[PDB]
C-alpha cells in the first residue's frame, strides 16, 4: 500500500479555470509519498548497519 499525502495553503487567485493549481504555488507545502509491505521493509537499513553508519569511526 502506497500513500500520497499533501497539505498546504492556497491563494484563491492562483487557482486556474479548471480548478487546478501547481504545487509550487502552495505556501506551506507538505508532500509525502510512502509505502508499506515487504517492498518498503526491503528499503530499510538493518539495525546493525544503521548503528555502524552512525557510530563507526569512518
Amino acid at each position: 500500500t502506497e500513500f500520497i499525502r499533501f497539505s498546504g495553503v492556497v491563494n484563491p487567485r492562483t487557482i486556474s479555470g479548471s480548478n487546478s493549481v501547481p504545487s509550487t504555488q502552495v505556501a506551506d507545502a507538505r508532500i509525502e509519498y510512502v509505502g508499506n509491505g515487504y517492498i518498503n521493509e526491503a528499503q530499510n537499513m538493518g539495525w546493525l548497519q544503521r548503528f555502524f553508519l552512525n557510530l563507526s569511526p569512518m
Partner: protein
C-alpha cells in the same frame, strides 16, 4: 468682492490626484493591445479579481 480675487487663504489649497484605469464601451477605437501589453495585463488583473482566471 476684490480681496477674494486678489489673495488666497493660508491652508485653503488644492491638491492633485492621479490614477490608472480602463475605459470600455468604445466602438472599435480602443487600444491595439499588441503594442500596449499593460492594457491586457490590467484587464486580466481585473478579471482575476472578479473571479475569472484567463
Amino acid at each position: 468682492e476684490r480681496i477674494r480675487d486678489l489673495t488666497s487663504v493660508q491652508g485653503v489649497r488644492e491638491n492633485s490626484l492621479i490614477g490608472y484605469g480602463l475605459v470600455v464601451g468604445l466602438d472599435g477605437t480602443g487600444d491595439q493591445t499588441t503594442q500596449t501589453p499593460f492594457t491586457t495585463q490590467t484587464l486580466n488583473n481585473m478579471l482575476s479579481q472578479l473571479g475569472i482566471t484567463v
